[model samples]
Target: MEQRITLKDYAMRFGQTKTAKDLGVYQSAINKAIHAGRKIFLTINADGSVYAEEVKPFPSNKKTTA
Candidate 1:
């Protein structure tokens, strides 16, 4: 199983937010990479994304006190 190398690549193509959803994560990491200029850490693509990686749009639901 190859989660493979595509996070940064895809983020390069689409955008931070785009890839975030692609990996079931938030734009936090994306933003970090942007402002940090460049850093050496898994933090860039460190959001529980490795192996068995799959692409799926985030779900739609809302909760409110009714």
Candidate 2:
């Protein structure tokens, strides 16, 4: 049988927590998730650095109720 691996699993296996400055990603604004609300994009480096960024809003096609 084959096993599926997840990002969190991989990170736990080989990831170090580093700030955005060290990773060169940088944070901007807050991103709200459709269901979860407030989501952040982050990356982990093998060198032990974690980078995070805000999720920008995408263009919506739904009509405004205003």
Candidate 3:
């Protein structure tokens, strides 16, 4: 059987489409998922260290962090 994957993987093979046909829903602003290559955000520090976090468009019915 085929394993599970994500739009990231699907898109890697096919491509990011605003159709969301795979989900059978209108992704609407898919850019919020994988806009361009600008998906993950990063921040640089004086120590040359970096902070990273993936993008989140639609959040659950709960609080989120910054």
> Best-fitting candidate, measured by TM-score?
1
Worst 10 residues of 1 by lDDT: 37-46
Predicted candidate 3 versus true structure: per-residue lDDT over 1-66, tens digit per residue:
233334455545555452255444355534455555544543334453433346656563478777
Overall lDDT per candidate, in order of appearance: 0.50, 0.37, 0.46
Q: Each model's TM-score, in the order given?
A: 0.36, 0.31, 0.33
lDDT tens per residue, model 1, 1-66 = 323454565566657676666556679866655555442122233454533233433342465453
Candidate 3 positional error at 11, Å: 2.0
Ranking by lDDT: 1, 3, 2
Write down the lDDT that model 2 would get. Answer: 0.37
What TM value does model 2 have? 0.31
RMSD of each: 13.0, 9.6, 14.1
Worst 10 residues of 2 by lDDT: 26-35
Clashes in model 2: which pairs? Answer: 18-50, 32-38, 33-38
Off by over 4 Å in 1: 1-5, 33-66
Summed backbone clashes in each candidate are: 0, 3, 0
